[PDB]
Design a protein around this nucleic acid. Structure first.
Lengths: 517, 94, 105, 91, 99, 98, 84, 106, 94
DNA sequence: CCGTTACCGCCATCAATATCCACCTGCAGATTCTACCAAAAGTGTATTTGGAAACTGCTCCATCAAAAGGCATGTTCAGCTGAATTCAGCTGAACATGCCTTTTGATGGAGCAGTTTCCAAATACACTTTTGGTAGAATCTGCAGGTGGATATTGATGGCGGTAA
DNA sequence: TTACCGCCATCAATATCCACCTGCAGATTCTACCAAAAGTGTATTTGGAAACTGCTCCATCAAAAGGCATGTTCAGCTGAATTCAGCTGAACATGCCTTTTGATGGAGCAGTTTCCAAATACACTTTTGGTAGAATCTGCAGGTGGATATTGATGGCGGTAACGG
């Protein structure tokens, strides 16, 4: 008890030192008759002090859990605009700033009570329906979720009625030598990589045994010509910038499969049944990702989904590339060169597809919806999603920089493309899988040319058409054959990207999964 | 309840000479009284300094004229000197 | 018979000024014409500021002199501003002045 | 919540008592169009300093008159001796 | 649907005009009174204050701050800027000679 | 030909004139200017040598102070060369002008 | 007596350079010097007149250092070493 | 046969201070201890300024106090500099001070 | 010739007390004379204003002490008030 | 090839807003009138005195001479500093949202002031003694000024190293 | 395979430090003088210490309300990067006029004597400005009704241009 008291007393004193932030929490809350109806375990700083002085703590994780439970109770009962909430937030910041060195002196990598953030709840009822925060839902096996509106619109008694506020605490692993309980995410320990067990960093330093090399790194992934070109261009640009914090960046193509997009029934009846336009279009879809070595750990930070309609594809899709999905994580080092690295990756991809003989590139500049993830699950709360105008300006910078390098010929909005090409029928418009235009054509069908012209004049600023003027083998990856599989596996395994440590853990997990395929 | 000396009713009279139909608020009148007190203190202090410098134990109208010339700006000092000279001449001939 | 202020043609109290000069320890002796001269100077300054404040109030559609009018009167005249450059007028405010660069276009 | 909402909330240390909109308004009266985020507290400190330039002197007056109440006349004297003569509080 | 929004500076200029055409006090009475009481406590215990003394202190402080702010505005304009920064305050106080 | 880069001799003069206290303005031109100004205000005046020396010393002190203020103002404007706008700003903040 | 004129040019360019060097100025624009001269002239017009006001007040025709000291003290430019 | 200056143990003349206070027209009456107090304050300030001037002269390998040493002493002490912030010392010069930007920027 | 009083011998004695082997020039002597005279004038004027403010016609040690506190900053004021208290105590102790 | 549509820039103008003004009207505050009286203020008389005039001793202020060397004056070259231009990260401006702190009014007593007593302490002044200015001559002494050489300071001269075509 | 910008290394031109030594105006040491203060010793007067007490008004506390503190979005403010015309610093030749030492006529500063108009100290009579209470008057602070530039934004048009069939 004396060791724990000596270690943990300075943090509690620092919390007490906060004036007036600590004043409301120095004594147990004495009812506000509804305080006990919300807070089932009312606790305060004096309770910590008496438990620590009495030696009621077997190990410091219980102490920190009590601290964080106190903070949670204060944040729950008090509203956001209340100054008590501000006091609790300041106390939490002070505790976060002070706790880590004390644990590192005690042999622990951290103290903070890490609890998994609420994941995106994709309701299994109406399509694209999500369950927001503090919204009630029905759960089956913690896997099948339905909102109240969809659940009522549909045995029903077996589905558990829950609320979208479940914070899952992170698991723990025991060090085989010292026995200290460590966060699995913080120490990045995975049983598949290290079957011999977990050994903490302090034990490794004290015994002089180096940590075993990771055999499932992004560097060891299968290499491809497009990925190699992207990696080479990114590394050359980083070396030209000569930033000390700019680590090596690895780009690997993980999926490459041939698919076919089918014409929807309305447009098929209007143009395919007469034999004027093909019933299907073949293409090759590719999924690649970018990894950065931060602190000797691979971090996945940027990846795309693309569709490549080759020269064998029937018109108007012949010799085209289309960007279906892309995502990014802001933890790239340095932050200033993150945007430039994304620029170099996109420019290298466009240069490669130009070298392959592709003619036109297509980009849709619509940002993801609020609470929706494209590829990376659980984006950090501080990552501001760009608005459509900001994304359009970013793509304008893309295209200006690309044209400055003579790599592209020109770029336009799709309305300018149609006006200059003098398109007369909807059959001449490119048809891509999951694209916005195929839905608009079916909606208009359910006269067509003028409606398409009006919608195109309305939405030209969102679509970019790029004028430009396969040696990579097919890669069968069921996990990366689309965005649904990865987003489902991350949700089922809590592979969040909301923080640098969680991003590292998720990257390690997906690298192991890809290597084990 | 001791009486507090103030130039109030005098300055108000001066107001009636310059603006018969215009009044003055209590705060503005306090501003005016403070102004006159400050100017009186400055002129008296400069006159005392001039008297001390010349080893003179008496302050006369010449010392006041020198003080107002030193303190007041050009046309203000000229008009103040003219008014003081006129008042002294009127008092002497009275 | 006649007050010293009346004999000198002034509204300010000559006797009060002389008494204050005596009690102010400014000099061992005070001349006869010194209080008259000082009262005349004070009366002239008060008349100037009062007429300026009345003009400011008239321009402000007002008939009562307020500290704002006194501040406007004392600041807009260069000599009066110089005389009270180290003086703050209570509840007087400042002159309307916007920098050229800060102006739009 | 519970506890109290008056006389027990004690916060906003004296220098922080001057609200951000107060400094903003003071700058607006000074004709300044744009304010840096670091100005406010800095201005507070400057304002802070100003008071020890005045109040202490007034206190030095108050102690001399054998009084326990600070009068406006002592404030006028302290302002005048610092080259910041104020009018209207000489009554 | 595109709510009305004034451009940065228009409302600032309107506030400039409004606060230069008015003479009312800007600093709230209670926090300034508390600050003055604390400052007096730092020099002499158990002091009392007249309302007129507090009003005079507030008026003097507001006037001094207005003068300092206009000086800093001139300083910022001198550096081809329109936003005052603490170095402008430092230079203004240095030229004034307070330190 | 040996030549020093611009600023080296300037800094040398800075150090030399900050290390010494000798008068920098010539006696006779300053005395002539003082006499001209005096006869502009009042004719047939006479001047003590100590009066002229005190006036020149006060003028030198005021000028070195104003030049220091001008140098700080110029440095604030990201410049090392003093321009009349700097001295005008210094005088305006000092209250000598506005 | 001779009516002296154009004596402001006696405040010479190297003199202003030396004064700026004492003041910590490394580089001087061409428009400073004349401007500086004017400021100096203003400073003279600020002080010597007051000294004349002293000299006229003492019924004297000779300006003494004591009157200069008085003018500097009343203008807030107190100087030591010349009496007072 | 004991002087009031030696009675208080001061070097400055108490009688001269009293006579100047009477002559200066500051009040109708002056207390007996006021000239002693003022002489003591003047003597303390003179002692401080002379100590600093002597230290400055010693730093300059000089045994005679000159106005340059006086200026060096007065401007190097914060309290004394604040006391004479609006005072000019004849033949005193200024402190050696060069801004960082004024230094070479190689 | 009319005698011109100065604090030369007292400043010299103080210098000898604080620096036995250090001299002082005539110009520096004038600087010190002006310095002590200016401090004398400032303290006397502050005490006179203090006496006038409290309707007091007598300048005692308390007014001088308060004037020194108002004028000298910090440590200078503390040492000056200590020396003044010691001096007045010694003077009244005989 | 010249022609439609996007972009830069102008600008003519529906529309929400703060505000100047045309008008109002109730009230805190300014203005008018009677009365009281201690507080000043004006006049009279004898006394004291600061400074005016009258003459003059005398310090230093103004003026003319001559030399010449310390800088003033003018010229030239380019080092690099101030000034103009672009643009992208980003810090503040404008604003809707929420609440809480400030403002206003009412109420006990801590001390601000008015009265009275009386004594340690302040002037008034006539001597007596000590002492700070200070004319004058004599000896001492810190540093002004010139010499010479060891010591940093500055700048780009020899060459070594990619490197960029 | 030739000039061109960088860097660490030496090296030459040059200002700096500094110890040393000599002539001297200024700093320090006595002799004597001496009138201006300083101090001691009575007489007289009074600023204020000290105690008791009525009257302010200041701290404390209640509710009513006019405000302040946060998070969001983004136009535009700002500072880094780039380029360049030209301004002034460094150097130098020529000579200008300021400084120093000297002397001199005298306008003018200041000491000394005389003495009177002016300031002072009461003593008395006269007016009068400060204060308290009643009651009348009103300038203007907001409150309500248009309503008006005004400026952001929606939009139309003219000029540039940019690439396509």
């Amino acid at each position: 008890p004396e060791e724990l008291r000596q270690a943990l007393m300075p943090t509690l004193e620092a919390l007490y030192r906060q004036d007036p932030e600590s004043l409301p929490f120095r004594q147990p809350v004495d009812p506000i008759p509804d305080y006990f109806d919300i807070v089932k375990n009312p606790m305060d700083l004096s309770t910590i002090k008496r438990k620590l002085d009495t030696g009621q703590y077997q190990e410091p994780w219980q102490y920190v859990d009590d601290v964080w439970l106190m903070f949670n109770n204060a944040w729950l009962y008090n509203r956001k605009t209340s100054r008590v909430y501000k006091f609790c937030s300041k106390l939490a910041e002070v505790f976060e700033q002070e706790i880590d060195p004390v644990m590192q002196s005690l042999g622990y990598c951290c103290g903070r009570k890490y609890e998994f953030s609420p994941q995106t709840l994709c309701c299994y009822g109406k399509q694209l329906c999500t369950i927001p925060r503090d919204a009630a839902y029905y759960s089956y096996q913690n896997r099948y979720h339905f909102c109240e509106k969809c659940f009522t619109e549909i045995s029903k008694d077996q589905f558990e009625k829950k609320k979208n506020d479940t914070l899952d605490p992170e698991p723990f692993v025991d060090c085989k030598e010292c026995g200290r309980k460590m966060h699995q995410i913080c120490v990045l320990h995975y049983d598949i990589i290290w079957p011999s067990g977990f050994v903490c960093d302090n034990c490794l330093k004290k015994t002089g045994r180096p940590r075993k090399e990771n055999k499932f790194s992004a560097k060891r992934l299968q290499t491809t010509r497009l990925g190699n070109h992207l990696e080479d261009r990114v590394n050359k640009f980083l070396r030209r910038q000569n930033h000390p914090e700019a680590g090596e960046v690895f780009v690997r193509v993980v999926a490459s499969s041939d698919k076919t997009v089918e014409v929807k029934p309305g447009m098929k009846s209007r143009f395919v049944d007469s034999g004027e336009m093909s019933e299907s279009f073949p293409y090759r879809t590719k999924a690649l990702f970018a990894f950065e070595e931060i602190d000797g750990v691979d971090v996945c930070f940027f990846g795309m989904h693309v569709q490549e309609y080759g020269s064998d594809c029937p018109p108007p899709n012949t010799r085209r590339v289309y960007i279906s999905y892309l995502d990014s994580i802001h933890f790239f080092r340095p932050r200033c060169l993150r945007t430039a690295v994304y620029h170099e990756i996109l420019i290298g991809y466009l240069e490669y597809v130009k070298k392959l003989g592709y003619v036109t590139g297509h980009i849709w500049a619509c940002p993801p919806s609020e609470g929706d993830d494209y590829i990376f699950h659980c984006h950090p709360p501080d990552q501001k999603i760009p608005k459509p105008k900001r994304l359009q300006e970013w793509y304008k910078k893309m295209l200006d920089k690309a044209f400055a390098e003579r790599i592209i010929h020109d770029y336009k909005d799709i309305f300018k493309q149609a006006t200059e090409d003098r398109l007369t029928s909807a059959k001449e418009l490119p048809y891509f899988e999951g694209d916005f235009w195929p839905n608009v054509l079916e909606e208009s069908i359910k006269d067509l040319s003028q409606k398409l012209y009006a919608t195109m004049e309305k939405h030209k600023e969102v679509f970019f058409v790029i004028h430009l003027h396969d040696p990579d083998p097919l890669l069968s990856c069921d996990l990366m054959d689309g965005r649904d599989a990865f987003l489902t596996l991350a949700r089922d395994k809590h592979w969040e990207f909301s923080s640098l440590r969680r991003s590292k853990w998720s990257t390690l997990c997906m690298l192991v999964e890809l290597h084990t395929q | 309840r001791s009486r507090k000396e103030s130039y109030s009713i005098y300055v108000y009279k001066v107001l009636k000479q310059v603006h018969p139909d215009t009044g003055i608020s209590s705060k503005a009148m306090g501003i005016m009284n403070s102004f006159v007190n400050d100017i009186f203190e400055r002129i008296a202090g400069e006159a005392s300094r001039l008297a001390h410098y010349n080893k003179r134990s008496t302050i006369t109208s010449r010392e006041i004229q020198t003080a107002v010339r030193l303190l007041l700006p050009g046309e203000l000092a000229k008009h103040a000197v003219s008014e003081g000279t006129k008042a002294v001449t009127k008092y002497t001939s009275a | 018979a006649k007050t010293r202020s009346s004999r000198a043609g002034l509204q300010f109290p000559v006797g009060r000024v002389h008494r204050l000069l005596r009690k102010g320890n400014y000099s061992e002796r005070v001349g006869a014409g010194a209080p008259v001269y000082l009262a005349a100077v004070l009366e002239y300054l008060t008349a100037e500021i009062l007429e300026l404040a009345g003009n400011a109030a008239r321009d402000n559609k007002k008939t009562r002199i307020i500290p704002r009018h006194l501040q406007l009167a004392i600041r807009n005249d260069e000599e009066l501003n110089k005389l009270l450059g180290r003086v703050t007028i209570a509840q007087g405010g400042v002159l309307p002045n916007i920098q050229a660069v800060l102006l739009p276009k | 919540k519970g506890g109290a909402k008056r006389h027990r909330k004690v916060l906003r240390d004296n220098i922080q008592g001057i609200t951000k909109p107060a400094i903003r308004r003071l700058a607006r009266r000074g004709g300044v169009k744009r304010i840096s985020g670091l100005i406010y507290e800095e201005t507070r400190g400057v304002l802070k300093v100003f008071l020890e330039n005045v109040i202490r002197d007034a206190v030095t007056y108050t102690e001399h008159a054998k009084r326990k109440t600070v009068t406006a006349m002592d404030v006028v004297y302290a302002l005048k001796r610092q080259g910041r003569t104020l009018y209207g509080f000489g009554g | 649907k595109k709510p009305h929004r004034y451009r940065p500076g228009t409302v600032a200029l309107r506030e400039i005009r409004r606060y230069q055409k008015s003479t009312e006090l800007l600093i709230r009475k209670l926090p300034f009174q508390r600050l003055v009481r604390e400052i007096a406590q730092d020099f002499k215990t158990d002091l009392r204050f007249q309302s007129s003394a507090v009003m005079a202190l507030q008026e003097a402080c507001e006037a001094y701050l207005v003068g300092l702010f206009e000086d800093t505005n001139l300083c910022a304009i001198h550096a081809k800027r329109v936003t005052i920064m603490p170095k402008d305050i430092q230079l203004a106080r240095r030229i004034r000679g307070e330190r």
